[PDB]
Amino acid sequence: DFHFSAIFQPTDPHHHQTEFAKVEGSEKYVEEVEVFGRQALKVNPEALTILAHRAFSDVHHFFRKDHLEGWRRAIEDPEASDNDRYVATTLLKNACIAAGRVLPSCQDTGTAIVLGKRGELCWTGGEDEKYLSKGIWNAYRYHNLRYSQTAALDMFKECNTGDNLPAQLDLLAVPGSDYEFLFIAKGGGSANKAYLYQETKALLNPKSLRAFIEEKLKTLGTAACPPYHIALVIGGTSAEMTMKTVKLASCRYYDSLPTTGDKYGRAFRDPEWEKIVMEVAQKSGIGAQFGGKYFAHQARVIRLPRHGASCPVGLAVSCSADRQILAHINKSGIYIEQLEQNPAQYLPTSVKVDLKRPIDKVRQQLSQYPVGTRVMLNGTLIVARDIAHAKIKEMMDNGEPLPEYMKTSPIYYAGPAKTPEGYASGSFGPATAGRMDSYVDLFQSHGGSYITLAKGNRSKQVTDACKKHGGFYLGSIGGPAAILAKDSIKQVTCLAFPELGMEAVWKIEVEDFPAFIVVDDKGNDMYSKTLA
């Protein structure tokens, strides 16, 4: 009466539907042997370094077809808003710049994540984590990427690791003699939009689930640079299993799962509720960052078994920097997923704001316009994000004044990637505004941060602060870090806190920097209707 049923039963477990390229000459890293009558593969662990290096290089300059098709759909759909088409066009042009292999597609070159599946008889010598980490180290050190990892020296004392390590290395033991991989360069902002809900059987009916989806999609907001790949996982054997599943679903790793359940509790994709997620996303009006239809590229919904007392639910997105690559090592060598090298084939007024004026004159000009107005910024921005804000608040709590450089220019929340030789700037797109919300009222009450520039919707405290203090929040397009660096950023200099690395305070000169007035000085917020 015993019947074993694996939870996950993909019809394409080795991902034959994906196109792979062989690393030339890589069959020299492997050797087929036989021990105790069974076939085994000896793998020179230097293959893991080579593979990880190429994976975490390529993934920053090219995209998958299904991601690029979504941007074209947003341009060509008659039901797309004008802002949908504008944002999607910008992202596609950004992808064309990134395809030049110098600038990465986003300044947040992400956390390096490796899902590895080592066959029982795949023999590497066992130092996989070291050799994989060396390849990741190579990719981030020898390319114009960014060191984004923050080490905790104690509970509160932190420093940048300076090399984008440690990686997340999830190496699984599986049958056979091959080594299969999914590499993910996961941005922090989209990682932050991975949510776990602890629900109950009372959720599991059509009316309750639909209302739940409507409520939760809004909480994603625009803070992870939509259009999104939206993944929703209902059920799971534990919270951590639910969240791992929703991550992998967002990477389309589970696309070949069955579409029906059975009495053994196997996982399945639910295309009907995928359609419902897309309808909710489209009718939400949130759009591709600034109102419209293209909140989402596509949706994945995976229904899981559950303990009768339990119903964990995971919701997560893949963002505009949709960065994963499949790979495998076998008797023939090293194979890596082929991404789209020619994104250009998918490619079918505003207010000039002079920032080279007194900030009060800039505030006066912005006050003339409603939320949703598109602006083009020309002049100096002061760049500061999470740690700089915390240090400055800490200074003020010790009686120190708000520094003068926080009062002369708009504050751009951003952290740049490394600058290529001969370039004015590396990739340099915006950070999530909402993480700095707790500082705006304080800084504005001390005569600074009257104008901020970042991406994402903000909390009500920021709307109230801008109305109280005559302030503004400007929304940059989120994601197009390469085209901003190439076309808009003309000069970059470190102004304060150099030891923070990318989180130092910078002074940058920009030209033709596009943004929308998201919050004005009158209590208005262009997200108040769609994200209420």
Added chain:
Amino acid sequence: DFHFSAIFQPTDPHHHQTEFAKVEGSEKYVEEVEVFGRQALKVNPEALTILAHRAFSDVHHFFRKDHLEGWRRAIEDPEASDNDRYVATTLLKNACIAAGRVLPSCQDTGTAIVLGKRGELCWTGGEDEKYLSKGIWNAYRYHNLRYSQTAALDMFKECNTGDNLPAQLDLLAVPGSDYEFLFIAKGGGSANKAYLYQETKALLNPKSLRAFIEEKLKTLGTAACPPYHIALVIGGTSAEMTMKTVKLASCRYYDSLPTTGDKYGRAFRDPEWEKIVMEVAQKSGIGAQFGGKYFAHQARVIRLPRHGASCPVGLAVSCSADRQILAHINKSGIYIEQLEQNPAQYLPTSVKVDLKRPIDKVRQQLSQYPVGTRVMLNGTLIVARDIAHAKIKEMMDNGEPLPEYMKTSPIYYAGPAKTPEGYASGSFGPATAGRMDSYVDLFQSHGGSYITLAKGNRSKQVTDACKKHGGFYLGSIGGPAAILAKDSIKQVTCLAFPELGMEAVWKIEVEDFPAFIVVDDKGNDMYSKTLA
């Protein structure tokens, strides 16, 4: 300049601090060999079946020393409340019954979770998941446990799998030639108290972190049968990594981690913040389920590296059914963690309520007493939990009456384990009340469910309903399922929905069933002060 640093660097990676017993004759399942100059281990996969069967059998009848010591501490501490000592004494006596190897310590025999670490040169034949699942199948089929897994036939249509499968099988590839394991029998209610928070750098200071802990600990409530092993994880490379870490911390799997960080971002335990967590738990007054000092046995706090833009935070507990077992297979055979076989060595005014009356007479008697009154129930209980409530609401939505059996007796939210031969009842302790909160006002408005009996604090809607309709919520002690079955439950009959398995409606005859009045018919709630 490259330096590899593993995130997790336990000083005791193989758990030498744990005592193990070898399965007699199990060296016949293993054979050390040497291939290509390296030491390897051949493992008959039947070893995995034998090991999983014994692990998921033993863990339901015995506990670890640090768990039992916590209950003794709550009994002997002069600062423990009377309710602290009463609950801890009850749980310790329950453990004495479970040690008889017939009744499991809790009716929720949990989800079967396997963390396995297969060495590069540990050769099983590769069918580990099937052979592990067979051993788990054996444990739940041939012992007096419970089938708790719910399969989804489609998004909403569900059935019990009837065998407690599927398991969660997390099998990792690691160096060496051994096979190391952590087996967890995870209750659904404590699995539900695994929470993920998406925080920011603004949290990472002493004042903010302390306030955060005070706020989140209350949201655990009493719904997972405290005293808790409380685990808190600050940081992580992804949501799913944070939640896996907090699970393992709650199992004391990471106890030998370093206690300081470094520039490479290694994980560490923070004993200072473990003490602060314990201080918050004790000063909360929540106590061991019914007010006092012993909200928590102990605390684990792990600080993790993070992407600069990210700060995931995990909070989770191990409950009174604290069930994990370490194991390993090596050249000498199968070794399994030795649990405490003699829990008795740790062992150093109520109102009689006659349920054999019209329910209105029972309500009148209960109305004479304040919340916090300890009560002893004698008579019939009608048993119904999540799916039965959902089915009954569906019937009423179709115009059908609230069933008669929802009106005659107090409703006990519970699902029994299997009945041992010759016993009146299998283990039969209470389910989490809060999951049924959305039905109370509706059912009471239709003349039923005036008295409910379960465990855990409930939402304000239930307090309002009981006051509006003259109802009561009685709190059973959470956890002591074996002693309740042995001493209190005299007769068990299936009443409705037999196809739901443990989730059928039952009619049981009880004697001397202890409970507290948690919500009365006047708007009072004995958790209103401690869980506000």
